[PDB]
Amino acid sequence: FVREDYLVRKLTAEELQELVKGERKVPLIVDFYATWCGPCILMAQELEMLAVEYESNAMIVKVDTDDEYEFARDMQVRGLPTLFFISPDPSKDAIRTEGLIPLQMMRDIIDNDM
Amino acid sequence: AEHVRAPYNGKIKFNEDLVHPTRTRHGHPAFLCYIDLSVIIES
């Protein structure tokens, strides 16, 4: 076996609707990157580090807005790098963050707001 | 071949009828001379 080089998992918009409708044990982080975007090179590395640091205690996934542009617009995304933190409790409001937020702000949100 | 180079800024002056027209090794037009030619430089 050779261990896969990346942990942040790309989803389609429908696979994301499935993942949000189904019950979750852990916070879901959704990254709306796009591959032409400069800051997304950095955000992808921050999210890879977050995805290692939290192991199975967070579900970190990404959605390329080249593919799911209308879904990004319906998510009220107004730019990239953008990130949703969706609580496992479905009553709570999700948090959208915009720009390269620090990895410590990601940890803060995941530990204290989700 | 030695190159003669202008020692001063100014206006070249000479009677160009004393010298034969030619095409240089570089395709530039030039004059080819077989005399002692005096060239003025009005600096």
Partner: protein, 38 residues
């Protein structure tokens, strides 16, 4: 044979001596270079 090949160029290869309009430096080249290098 020059003239037979001239005819063969005209008839088969489609040759004609289309006159070339030259800038005076290109004409000077196309004349002076007939006489020698320098």
């Amino acid at each position: 044979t020059e003239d037979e090949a001239r005819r063969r160029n005209w008839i088969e290869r489609g040759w004609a001596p289309w006159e070339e309009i030259l800038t005076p430096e290109a004409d000077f080249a196309r004349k002076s270079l007939n006489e020698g290098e320098e």
